Design a protein around this ligand. Structure first.
Ligand SMILES: N#Cc1ccc(Cn2cnc3ccccc32)cc1
Length: 291
């Protein structure tokens, strides 16, 4: 799967909010482009002159993520974050010349990402009370991955001492994306666990944090809530469900070719971190069938 690379696999079946630190620093920002940020401004002007109802928004930038020695006490992960924007994204990661920016970043800074916006995405493996994962079909009319399968998520917007509020907004935002797109009540959702971070190589290496969330509703009740919003309550064009039993072999199915890269990241991390049992009981042949 060349369009997705794992940057982080979390320990202990995934990390809660209280075990994560963030360091939000201008040292974690994108570097100015070699010929100046005028190139980003030019692309933006052209876009507004065709679609003048577009607006910029601030985003978190992922610089890097360091895991503690496994089995240690104290904070288990440090996220190094800067700030970027939707405008910076359209001028860098989305640019036709994004591969040239990666090569220049290797040359100038020994970092393929130094000249890229790299806005941080969030995504969820959302499980139902009757043990299914939730999938959404993308409209065929949008710019990115038209007509492909996705999982719930989005790109959160800003506003360990500022750090702890930043971790809280990341965890909060994945629940809010589920309530906005799936139309579920907040009180039916567990606190998220971070599974890991996956990079989209079809979008010049921008990264998504992938979380596990458990819902107290069955698949039938989730479908009712989603549909009862009507066509205007969601950006997706349909919802569907796969048994957690069958998610194990999803990369061998015809569905795999229809999954967008960030949804592939979510399913790979779910399989490695929530699946793949380590103990004698769940590991026994009748409960973990070979092949
Ligand atoms: N920062 C950031 C960010 C990154 C990707 C996307 C999804 N996406 C992809 N292409 C798009 C064009 C227009 C609108 C949204 C779009 C949204 C925000």
């Amino acid at each position: 799967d060349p369009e997705v690379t794992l940057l982080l696999q979390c320990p202990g079946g995934g990390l809660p909010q209280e075990q994560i630190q963030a360091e939000l620093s201008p040292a974690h920002d994108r570097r100015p482009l070699p010929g100046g940020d005028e190139a980003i401004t030019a692309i933006w002007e052209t876009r507004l002159k065709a679609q003048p109802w577009l607006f910029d928004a601030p985003k978190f930038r992922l610089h890097s993520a360091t895991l503690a020695p496994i089995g240690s006490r104290g904070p288990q992960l440090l996220l190094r974050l800067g700030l970027t924007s939707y405008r910076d994204f359209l001028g860098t990661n989305w640019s036709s010349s994004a591969a040239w920016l990666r090569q220049q970043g290797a040359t100038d800074w020994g970092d393929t990402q130094a000249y890229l916006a790299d806005p941080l995405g969030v995504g969820a493996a959302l499980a139902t009370a009757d043990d299914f994962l939730v999938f959404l079909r993308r409209s065929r009319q949008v710019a990115e991955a038209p007509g492909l399968v996705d999982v719930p998520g989005g790109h959160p917007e800003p506003q360990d001492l500022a750090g702890q509020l930043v971790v809280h907004e990341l965890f909060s935002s994945v629940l809010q994306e589920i309530c906005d797109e799936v139309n579920l009540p907040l009180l039916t959702l567990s606190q998220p666990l971070l599974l890991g971070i996956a990079r989209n190589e079809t979008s010049a290496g921008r990264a998504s944090a992938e979380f596990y969330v458990q819902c107290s509703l069955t698949s039938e009740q989730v479908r009712k809530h989603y549909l009862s919003g009507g066509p205007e309550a969601h950006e997706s064009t349909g919802i569907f469900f796969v048994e957690t039993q069958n998610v194990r072999r999803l990369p061998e199915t015809e569905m795999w070719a229809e999954l967008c890269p960030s949804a592939k990241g979510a399913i790979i991390l779910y399989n490695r971190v929530q699946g793949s049992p380590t103990g004698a009981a769940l590991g026994s042949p009748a409960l973990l069938p070979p092949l």
